[PDB]
Design a protein around this nucleic acid. Structure first.
Ligand SMILES: Nc1ccn(C[C@@H](CO)OCP(=O)(O)OP(=O)(O)OP(=O)(O)O)c(=O)n1
Ligand SMILES: [Ca+2]
Ligand SMILES: [Ca+2]
Ligand SMILES: [Ca+2]
Lengths: 1005, 218, 419
DNA sequence: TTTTTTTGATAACTTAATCTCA
DNA sequence: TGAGATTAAGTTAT
């Protein structure tokens, strides 16, 4: 088809196995191309002639070197050189699988081999020539030499795409829709064809409606069709029977759409539609290969992913659709759950988290409330997204607590103008979100009417359009294209594999470019190794500006600096006593000078050893550093793309992509220390961690107690390289561009892996920011070296450090001033945790703010603060226990279900199993659910708590707190009191209050 | 050896006392599906549904599991056919007659062997086509396999891809062997050395060895 | 599924059958195989073990201290020696009773055990007894052969065995003290054997019998006796000159024997043995002070700190005496067997074995020191922590560090030329 | 009428249940 | 009937 652009790649699963490509031309027609797919093996030239059945095809790979990357322990300096052998290699293609004994490079996929050897990118535009193409069908072509056909690549051009965003609503009586006894009531489609037309249509099962209701609807303008051929997609509401509804659904699902998008539809929607189709009629949803040679029926299959820590077990489950027509069936639930961390993963929660804006009060009313939004009220792009979602939206949440029905809406040229139904809130600026509703589907189905049918149709089409809104908001198309380009994978499996698989494409490309093969023979023994270093905090409250300096990509840059690769490791030298250790050190300092070799002092891997030195060669760049350089370049490009964005959605997408690439770069290191990986390297991981610890220690030592005065800055220690002598000035007296009247002193107070918190004896925000910028400029050229670079993160105020990894503060960004509004940030405290409470966090915030203000103004003439704080705690707790005005939602906990446990009697197993055995709603193997402590109401306040887990019950979606059941407030109150006690200074009153209220000993940090 | 009745053709739930915590849920699991199950003609005998649920299950140590009864004809118990013609049973019998050392036989009838029980995952089929009743029996098969696994020590299943998702199907860990079906191309079941595996597993789990040639019928 | 899995798990079952007769390597292999089995099959009937106490009482009946009636079968007689007991399960080291200590076999005993066990597979294990730096053929439990032919083959391979006598008894004769004395006299075997354990044909389990009389005696003195090159054995004397044998130094340490104090000692017809089961830091220095400062506890025995030079190096390398380094290199390169052994061993280990120092004590002493090393040779050493000097053995070893460093420098210099 | 491709690391804190010791 | 230590699980920072 000459100028075509690829959309998806898929394989044939018949007796004659083929590979297929779906592409689109500039005009808009679809072209399918077929290839014979083989099994690829790599052999040596000597082995190639020793094959009794001659290979079907063989291509010379040239001369490549094979290197053994097994690691051995040496007790002396007599280290034998690594075994490497250079030989000519052959890539052989077999129509059927073979069993060659001495075959290498066997960890790569066959589709990866096809892509890399044929020089074809999964996504791209090509000029296919007709010499290598023959017609086998109307639109389907056959190619025998994909290498020569794809020799011409052209710049990317835009193409039309087809979308089917679908949702269904099934009647349910008491518990859950059952495909054997409960029918489908509503089916809403957002249909986008290659012409760009966007048609929204909802089909309503008429067998649930009375004849008079059908007449009323058809008079109002609802089409009442009788057969498949009488259906038009240009109408909004179509009344039909269930059989005709299912036939229309099957007809739509059999079309060659580019994308068929659902939210949890692979597990519920598509399965329900299919099973009903075979139950009522007996027909099948037939998928066909492009050449019309092999046909399959729709059958959703389950894919289980196991863990990799402490007895693997099942960890997650996904559901997929089998089809051989090139259509991608996408479920947004799995994509959002894999890529985001949230308290809940329901549609309402994600919509509320994503679709929010700030509204300005413009009118009031007896029961109404008019809002407005634009670029002046909130950030740029929020109002446009809110208006786009508001086209089908019905309910709006105000202040994250009030759910209000939309009375009237008006889309403007810059924002929105919506009037709600809520009391007169006496403020000027509020927050509007698209979240939970106040509709009881169980009650509506029991009193089903025409108006309720129309309301359900509106809600269903809103959900179908929410699928599209989340598709556009998360940049799934852009992410898919980027993943296919980077990982060298078909578009249908970009978000299906973890780091162990998505790096094999670039790894194979790098290995072929460098002409290297890595082999291992010996077994891999596992030993623990030490991680990063965390400094103990010196104070809880500081009342001074703290300057934060953070290393950029610490571990990838450490690996690049040290050339840490399994094939570049010279050896490991261990010692048992001090005599041998000293002799080995004397020999080693002169045998391997450090312009070329680097020696890392690691902790011994065995108790009998007292020393362990890992030697690395930096003459030749390693395999891991090149991959890390590639990924850092990708992340830098995506950061540059992020910084040149003005819309909120584009900024969010770019931030997510750069975070994903940073996590990929980190996972490269993590896999370098993963036993079940091909790139396993215990010594490399130990060396990287040790070098990181040395770097953070060096930064902390040089920054602690480094005063400045006049035009000079004096560092604590000499600017000397912590690994070997280098050609840099070590004088800690540095000329600074700051004016002559500045005099301040610094003191290191905390550290974590690569972050250093340095306080300054100052309070002026502009002064602190200027000094921090100057210092960050100064400690990147005179202090650091090679590729080690740090950046000034922010200025922290009112820093309250509870522990070594939990602290809350107010953040001033690098580009800010005194008048700039701070941002409140919490790291590890009981406010970002997903399983503490909602009632807990608000009180924690209020009490922490009050304590910060009260310490800032000046107090502590006596016990003082403790008395009033504990009195307030007692009053609030007794008021909550008596009134019980808080809802059940404020006392809800979240936990993830999984089957990775040491014992089968674990209470977490029992709770989920018992819930599943008595509830039609089944919690999957990676589903996050809700639970809470509920106790009999007649039970009074309990002093000594004995059993806690026995009171846990799962609040799925509709649990009702009965008269006999009440929230067991004791656990929450005890946790809140225990957290608050550790914040205060005086103790005797704290233990006294804990004994009086509960009757235990409060643990102190 | 008791029984319970339901409102659907089979309504012949003769069951043993050791199968007690099964029927009380199987009744609801089968009532909602019997109406659509009995509308078609199957190829077990309809009365041969709850026939292996009256046997004592705390006597067997190894369980061999089938995925589907024979697409043509059928008796009611897996891997039994006193009309010996089929290829799968031929391949099963050849590799065990070679192991035991008996050359003269008139079938195997693996059911009669003490210490082992043949199991069918899907309790019904249809004439001509296989795996045509999976939806009607999925949850019932799950519950029955879970109960059988809870009592036996080792489970044997036929079909690699057909039983590729059995670990998540059961919540209680158990010794499981998934063997190749004796109908694939190249006759891979000949290379399948699994009977020795299950036997030596019984000795490794301090269980009484089970004689294997006992079931031969002359 | 496959043959490899079958072989692996049947080897796991075989290892499970012999669980008490295991060492560190076998425990690690068993754990690895259990992990592989439970990962592949999702469940395994056996679990992990980490303690593994060595027990032999499951193959031996309760001890007998009373005349008893016997008549079953033949009466192959086998005495029991006095001393430490070691177990050779299959291709392993020597396992001590209780704690799974790994004894250091010199060379010939391990080869003899391997050659004896390679003949068949029906033998449960091989039992050895060590007394004053010598081995003896103990009971040979076996489920296939009678122990007579195992004894004969072990004797002809090169190790020593006790004599055996077979007698047929018709009626239930009352074995008494007189029969025990007569058969121990007929055994000759001047080595101080304590008990006698006769086998029973047909009955797999063996039986042990010994007769003794309690006695109380007085302690005169404790003295060391030479039984080798710097290997000393403790001993005591009585007023009448009677000798009370002690199996090893640990027996004396646990007994807490006090000078000029009455003790309980088990007396027999020929010789008598002190009885155990009567802190450690007090005795470990008190006995050292009484016997002499110039002594230390070399593991199971006593060793004397003295001179260390060319004579010790020649003795340890099994070469004749010489004068200079050139004669050393010539005499150790003349035969290619010794030089290969020297190449495979480090300077530190070779010097430590030449001076006969302990392993753990010397390692701790070295790790609690500071050294100045030039040209791969030691010229200055000093103590950084004096706490480790509290142990008298550490002080005794440190008192002669000059000889050790001289030997270390000589070995380093000669290895610089042997390559 | 049945069958190829998976799996990043450690450090630090909090709470409940179990084991051990006055 | 308390105190103290230890292990397993969940979750976050880096
Ligand atoms: N997913 C992660 C996250 C963190 N770390 C530890 C360490 C090295 O990756 O974090 C140091 P940085 O250089 O990645 O720094 P940080 O995580 O703060 O990223 P940055 O601010 O540079 O985007 C890790 O190993 N894996
Ligand atoms: Ca839905
Ligand atoms: Ca919906
Ligand atoms: Ca960083």
């Amino acid at each position: 088809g000459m100028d075509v652009r690829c959309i998806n790649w898929f394989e044939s699963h018949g007796e004659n196995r083929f590979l297929y490509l779906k592409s689109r031309c500039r005009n808009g027609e679809t072209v399918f191309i077929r290839f014979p797919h083989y099994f690829y093996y790599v052999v040596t030239d000597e082995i190639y002639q020793s094959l009794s059945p001659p290979p079907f095809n063989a291509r010379p790979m040239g001369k490549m070197r094979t290197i053994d990357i097994d690691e051995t322990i040496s007790y002396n300096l007599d280290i034998k050189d690594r075994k490497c052998s250079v030989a000519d290699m052959w890539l052989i293609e077999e129509p059927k699988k073979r069993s060659i004994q001495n075959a290498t490079m066997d960890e790569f996929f066959n589709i990866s081999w096809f892509y890399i050897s044929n020089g074809i990118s999964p996504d791209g535009c090509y000029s296919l020539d007709e010499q290598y193409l023959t017609k086998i069908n109307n639109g389907c072509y056959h190619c025998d030499d994909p290498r020569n056909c794809f020799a011409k690549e052209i710049p990317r051009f835009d193409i039309p795409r087809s979308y089917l965003f679908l949702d269904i609503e099934c009647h349910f009586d008491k518990k859950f829709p059952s495909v054997f006894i409960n029918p489908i009531s509503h089916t809403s489609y957002c249909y986008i064809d290659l012409s760009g037309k966007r048609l929204l249509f909802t089909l309503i099962n008429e067998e649930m409606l009375t004849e008079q209701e059908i007449q009323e609807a058809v008079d109002r303008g609802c089409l009442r069709i009788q057969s498949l051929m009488e259906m038009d997609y240009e109408r909004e509401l179509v009344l039909c029977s269930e059989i005709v509804l299912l036939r229309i659904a099957k007809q739509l699902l059999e079309l060659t759409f580019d994308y068929v998008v659902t939210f949890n539809g692979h597990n519920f929607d598509l399965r329900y539609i299919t099973n009903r189709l075979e139950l009522l009629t007996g027909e099948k949803i037939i998928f066909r290969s492009p050449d019309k040679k092999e046909a399959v029926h729709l059958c959703i299959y389950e894919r289980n992913q196991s863990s990799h820590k402490g007895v693997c077990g099942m960890a997650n489950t996904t559901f997929h659709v089998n089809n051989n027509n090139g259509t991608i069936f996408f479920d947004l639930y799995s994509f959002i759950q894999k890529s985001e961390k949230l308290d809940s993963y329901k549609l309402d929660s994600i919509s509320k988290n994503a679709f929010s804006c700030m509204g300005k009060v413009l009118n009031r009313g007896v029961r109404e409330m008019t809002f407005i939004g634009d670029d002046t009220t909130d950030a740029k792009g929020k109002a446009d997204t809110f208006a786009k979602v508001l086209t089908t939206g019905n309910y709006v949440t105000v202040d994250e607590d009030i759910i209000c029905k939309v009375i009237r809406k008006d889309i403007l040229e810059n924002g929105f103008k919506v009037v709600l139904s809520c009391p007169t809130l006496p403020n000027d600026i509020y927050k509007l979100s698209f979240g939970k509703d106040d509709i009881d589907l169980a009650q509506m189905y029991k009193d089903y009417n025409l108006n309720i049918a129309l309301d359900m149709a509106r809600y269903c089409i809103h959900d179908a359009c929410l699928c599209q809104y989340l598709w556009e908001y998360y940049g799934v198309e852009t992410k898919t294209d980027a993943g296919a380009a980077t990982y060298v994978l078909p578009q249908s499996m970009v978000f299906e594999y973890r780091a162990s698989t998505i790096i094999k494409g670039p790894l194979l490309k790098l290995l072929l470019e460098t002409k290297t093969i890595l082999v291992r023979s010996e077994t891999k023994q596992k030993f623990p190794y030490e991680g990063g270093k965390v400094f103990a905090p010196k104070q809880k409250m500081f009342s001074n500006n703290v300057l934060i300096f953070d290393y950029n990509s610490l571990y990838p840059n450490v690996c690049i600096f040290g050339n840490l690769s399994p094939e570049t490791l010279v050896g490991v030298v261990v010692s048992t006593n001090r005599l041998e250790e000293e002799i080995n050190n004397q020999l080693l300092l002169q045998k391997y000078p450090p312009p070329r070799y680097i020696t890392v002092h690691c902790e011994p891997r065995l108790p009998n050893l007292i020393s362990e030195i890992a030697i690395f060669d930096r003459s030749i760049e390693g395999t891991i550093p090149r991959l890390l350089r590639t990924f850092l370049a990708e992340r830098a490009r995506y950061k540059k793309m992020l910084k040149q964005a003005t819309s909120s959605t584009e900024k969010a997408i770019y931030d997510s992509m750069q975070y994903t690439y940073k996590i990929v770069a980190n996972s490269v290191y993590g896999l370098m220390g993963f036993r079940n990986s091909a790139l396993y390297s215990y010594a490399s991981a130990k060396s990287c961690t040790s070098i990181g610890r040395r770097m953070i220690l060096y930064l902390e030592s040089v920054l602690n107690g480094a005063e400045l005065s006049n035009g000079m800055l004096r560092f604590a220690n000499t600017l000397s390289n912590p690994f070997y002598m280098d050609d840099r000035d070590i004088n800690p007296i540095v000329k600074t561009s700051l004016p002559i009247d500045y005099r301040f002193r610094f003191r290191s107070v905390y550290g974590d892996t690569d972050s250093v918190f340095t306080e300054i004896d100052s309070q002026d925000v502009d002064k602190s920011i200027e000094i921090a910028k100057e210092l960050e400029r100064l400690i990147n050229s005179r202090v650091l070296f090679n590729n080690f670079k740090i950046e000034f993160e922010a200025v922290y105020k009112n820093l309250i450090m509870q522990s070594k990894k939990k602290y809350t503060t107010m953040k001033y960004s690098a580009s800010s001033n005194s008048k700039s509004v701070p941002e409140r940030i919490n790291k590890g405290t009981s406010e970002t945790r997903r399983d503490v409470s909602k009632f807990h966090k608000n009180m924690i915030k209020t009490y922490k703010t009050r304590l910060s203000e009260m310490l800032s103004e000046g107090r502590m003439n006596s016990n003082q603060v403790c008395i009033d704080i504990l009195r307030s705690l007692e009053t609030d707790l007794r008021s909550e226990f008596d009134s019980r005005s808080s809802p059940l939602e404020l006392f809800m906990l979240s936990r993830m279900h999984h089957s990775n446990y040491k014992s089968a009697d674990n209470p977490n197993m029992y709770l989920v199993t018992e819930y599943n055995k008595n509830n039609p709603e089944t919690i999957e193997l990676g589903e996050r659910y809700y639970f809470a402590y509920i106790c009999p109401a007649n039970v009074p306040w309990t002093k000594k708590l004995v059993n806690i887990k026995t009171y846990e019950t799962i609040i799925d979606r509709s649990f009702k707190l009965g008269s006999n059941q009440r929230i067991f407030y004791e656990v929450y109150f005890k946790r809140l009191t225990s957290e608050i006690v550790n914040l205060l200074d005086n103790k005797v009153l704290c233990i006294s209050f804990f004994q009086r209220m509960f009757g235990s000993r409060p643990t102190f940090y | 050896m008791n029984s319970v009745t339901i409102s659907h053709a089979p309504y012949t739930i003769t069951y043993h006392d050791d199968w007690e915590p099964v029927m009380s849920q199987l009744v609801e699991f089968y009532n909602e599906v019997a109406s659509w199950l009995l509308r078609d003609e199957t190829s077990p005998i309809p009365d041969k549904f709850f026939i292996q649920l009256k046997q004592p299950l705390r006597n067997k140590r190894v369980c061999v599991c089938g995925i589907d009864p024979y697409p043509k004809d059928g008796t009611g118990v897996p891997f039994e056919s006193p009309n010996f013609t089929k290829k799968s049973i031929k391949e099963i019998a050849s590799s065990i007659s070679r192991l035991t050392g008996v050359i003269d036989y008139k079938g195997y009838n693996l059911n009669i062997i003490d210490g082992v029980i043949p199991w069918n995952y899907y309790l019904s089929c249809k004439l001509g086509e296989t795996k045509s009743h999976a939806i009607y029996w999925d949850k019932i098969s799950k519950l029955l396999l879970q109960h059988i696994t809870k009592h036996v020590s080792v489970l044997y299943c036929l079909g690699k891809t057909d039983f590729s998702n059995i670990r998540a199907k059961l919540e209680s860990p158990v010794t499981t062997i998934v063997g190749y079906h004796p109908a694939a191309r190249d006759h891979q079941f000949e290379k399948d050395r699994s009977f020795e595996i299950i036997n030596v597993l019984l000795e490794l789990d301090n269980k009484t060895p089970i004689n294997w040639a006992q079931g031969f019928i002359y | 599924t496959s043959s490899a899995d079958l072989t692996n798990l049947k080897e796991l079952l075989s290892l499970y059958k012999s669980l008490r007769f295991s060492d560190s390597v076998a425990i690690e292999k068993y754990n690895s195989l259990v992990e592989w089995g439970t990962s592949t099959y999702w469940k395994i009937g056996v679990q992990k073990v980490t303690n593994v106490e060595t027990s032999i009482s499951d193959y031996y009946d309760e001890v007998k201290n009373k005349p008893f009636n016997i008549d079953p079968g033949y009466y192959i007689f086998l005495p029991v020696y006095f001393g430490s007991v070691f177990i050779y399960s299959k291709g392993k080291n020597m396992v001590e009773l209780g704690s799974g200590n790994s004894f250091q076999i010199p060379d010939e005993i391990r080869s003899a055990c391997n050659k004896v066990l390679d003949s068949d597979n029906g033998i449960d294990f091989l039992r050895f007894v060590l007394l004053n730096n010598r081995w003896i053929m103990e009971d040979a439990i076996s489920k296939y052969q009678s122990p007579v032919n195992i004894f004969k083959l072990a004797s002809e391979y090169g190790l020593n065995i006790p004599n055996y006598l077979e007698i047929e008894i018709e009626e239930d004769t009352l074995f008494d003290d007189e029969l025990y004395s007569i058969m121990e006299r007929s055994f000759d075997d001047t080595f101080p054997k304590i008990s006698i354990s006769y086998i029973k044909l047909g009955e797999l389990k063996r039986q042990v019998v010994d007769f003794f009389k309690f006695s109380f005696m007085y302690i005169e003195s404790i003295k060391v006796d030479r039984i080798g090159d710097n290997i000393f054995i403790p001993s005591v004397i009585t007023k009448s000159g009677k000798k009370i044998l002690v199996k090893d130094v640990d027996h004396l340490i646990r007994s807490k024997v006090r000078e000029h104090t009455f003790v309980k000692v088990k007396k027999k017809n020929t010789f008598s043995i002190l009885y155990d089961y009567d802190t450690r830091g007090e005795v470990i220095k008190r006995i050292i002070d009484t016997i002499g400062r110039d002594y230390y506890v070399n593991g199971k025995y006593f060793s004397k700190v003295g001179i260390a030079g060319l004579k010790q190096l020649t003795n340890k390398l099994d070469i004749n005496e010489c004068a200079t380094v050139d004669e050393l290199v010539d005499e150790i390169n003349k035969s290619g067997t010794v030089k290969r052994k020297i190449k495979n061993q480090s300077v530190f280990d070779l010097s430590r074995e030449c001076l006969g120092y302990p392993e753990a004590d010397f390692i701790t002493l070295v790790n609690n020191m500071r050294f100045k090393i030039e040209n791969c040779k030691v010229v200055n050493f000093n103590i950084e922590n004096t706490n480790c000097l509290n142990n008298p053995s550490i002080e005794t070893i440190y008192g002669n560090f000059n000889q050790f460093v001289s030997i270390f420098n000589t070995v380093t210099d000669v290895k610089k030329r042997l390559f």
